[PDB]
Design a protein around this ligand. Structure first.
Ligand SMILES: OC[C@H]1O[C@@H](O)[C@H](O)[C@@H](O)[C@H]1O
Ligand SMILES: [Cl-]
Ligand SMILES: [Hg+2]
Ligand SMILES: [Hg+2]
Ligand SMILES: [Hg+2]
Ligand SMILES: [Hg+2]
Ligand SMILES: [Hg+2]
Ligand SMILES: [Hg+2]
Length: 263
């Protein structure tokens, strides 16, 4: 059950005036592709806050990567789901090495040394790499049952150029005449149920490959792409959400650089 939104004053959407004329804002299966200018964050914030939405952000920090946690968490505090309930889950082999980062109210961090917990603790799960930093708003506009993010190096490439696993012997195999987009494995998520379905599917597919003596060209990412090809995401995030400015600069098509790689 969802309560009614309160009175709100904002610019009237214009039916005869497209959001963007330079990019695709909706997929062929009617899933929005999230770009700056396509959403009114005030309306979305209201919708998700009225549902007391809790977002879980999971990251794995092993070995040398624990060094990226401080910047990752500090910037997440400034740009990730601000105003909403957030629960960080840091999976690490060095619990004592996790930095003591100051969190805003309604935000929590759990250290898990290296389930049902997720189903009872959060509504959505967002899975990202730790060697990154938030530079701009990353909010509820990304929440949906299942989402993938366009890889910054292939958003303008033809499917033939996509680095999908091309060997039929692999469970992640995708032929040259198939494929919608090339999603990057560094940023995906959705409802806890959908994320667990995806991780379960990929885990089993990888085991099958292992038994067959084969390893997907881009490992987990190859399997992620096969899954999202067969189970269309309900939202697709634009490269604004996964960028590398030193490697790719700042093209006009990107009005904002929200989550980027750390040099
Ligand atoms: O072609 C796929 C590869 O693209 C690279 O730019 C990226 O650093 C790799 O992690 C992998 O995603
Ligand atoms: Cl994950
Ligand atoms: Hg618009
Ligand atoms: Hg995850
Ligand atoms: Hg993760
Ligand atoms: Hg998969
Ligand atoms: Hg996997
Ligand atoms: Hg996967």
């Amino acid at each position: 059950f969802m309560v009614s939104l309160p009175r709100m004053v904002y610019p009237q959407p214009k039916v005869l005036t497209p959001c963007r004329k330079d990019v695709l804002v909706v997929t062929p299966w009617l899933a929005p592709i999230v770009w700056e200018g396509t959403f009114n964050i005030d309306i979305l914030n209201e919708q998700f806050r009225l549902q007391n939405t809790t977002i879980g952000l999971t990251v794995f920090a092993i070995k040398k990567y624990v060094a990226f946690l401080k910047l990752f968490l500090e910037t997440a505090e400034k740009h990730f789901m601000v105003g909403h309930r957030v629960h960080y889950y840091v999976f690490t082999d060095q619990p004592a090495a996790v930095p003591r980062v100051t969190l805003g109210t309604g935000r929590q961090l759990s250290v898990l040394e290296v389930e049902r917990r997720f189903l009872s603790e959060v509504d959505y799960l967002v899975c990202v790499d730790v060697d990154m930093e938030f530079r701009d708003h990353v909010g509820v506009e990304i929440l949906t049952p299942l989402f993938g993010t366009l890889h910054p190096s292939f958003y303008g490439s033809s499917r033939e150029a996509f680095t999908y696993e091309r060997r039929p012997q692999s469970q992640a195999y995708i032929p040259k005449d198939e494929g919608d987009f090339y999603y990057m494995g560094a940023f995906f998520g959705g409802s806890v149920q959908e994320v667990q379905r995806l991780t379960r599917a990929c885990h089993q597919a990888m085991m099958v490959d292992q038994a067959n003596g084969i390893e997907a060209v881009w490992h987990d990412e190859s399997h992620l792409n096969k899954y999202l090809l067969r189970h269309k995401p309900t939202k697709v995030l634009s490269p604004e959400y996964l960028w590398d400015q030193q490697l790719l600069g700042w093209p006009a098509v990107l009005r904002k650089l929200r989550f980027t790689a750390v040099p």
